[PDB]
């Protein structure tokens, strides 16, 4: 039996750690993302992989809002995607976001 609300954070990619030894959270695996897409559920998926795990400013503001009793979010963009962008740009490939 294990639980996690807000604990540590990995280093290279800002996501909650894994395992019970560290105070890590569970893994919303790929197949679960498919399952959520199968419903019409879109908001829950978007928050569940934007503001609950990765987008740092998003989750700080989410915590502030929740404490202040006003449920909302500020999505932003995942940090892991920026990691991928830099890593793929480290080759000769020039990849960027347009207008």
């Amino acid at each position: 039996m294990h639980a996690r609300s807000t604990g540590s954070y990995s280093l290279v990619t800002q996501q909650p750690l894994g395992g019970k030894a560290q105070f890590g959270g569970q893994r919303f695996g790929e197949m679960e993302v498919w399952a959520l897409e199968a419903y019409g559920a879109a908001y829950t998926l978007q928050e569940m992989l934007t503001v609950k795990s990765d987008d740092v400013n998003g989750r700080t503001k989410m915590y502030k809002n929740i404490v202040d009793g006003n449920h909302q979010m500020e999505p932003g963009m995942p940090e892991s995607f920026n990691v991928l962008l830099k890593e793929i740009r480290s080759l000769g490939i020039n990849i960027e976001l347009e207008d």
Binding site: G40, N70, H71
Partner: protein, 79 residues
């Protein structure tokens, strides 16, 4: 308390825009300083919004027209 959403879906026959309209109403109710149109029995805002939708005294179009009316008065509130 609610267990189903069937009748509410009957009032709003899409089951997707239902979510958005109910969310907007609950947002008015929680952070906004509005009040319910149905007596509350120690129920949270989401369920109260769904119950309001159920009786058919709030749907998308009436919500929009009420928003327009209150915004018109707000424009008239500065004088």
């Amino acid at each position: 308390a609610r267990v189903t959403v069937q009748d509410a879906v009957e009032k709003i026959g899409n089951r997707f825009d239902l979510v958005l309209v109910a969310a907007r109403r609950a947002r008015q109710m929680q952070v906004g300083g509005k009040d319910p149109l149905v007596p509350e029995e120690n129920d949270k805002t989401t369920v109260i919004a769904l119950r309001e939708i159920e009786e058919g005294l709030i749907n998308n179009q009436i919500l929009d027209v009420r928003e327009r009316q209150e915004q018109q008065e707000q424009e008239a509130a500065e004088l």
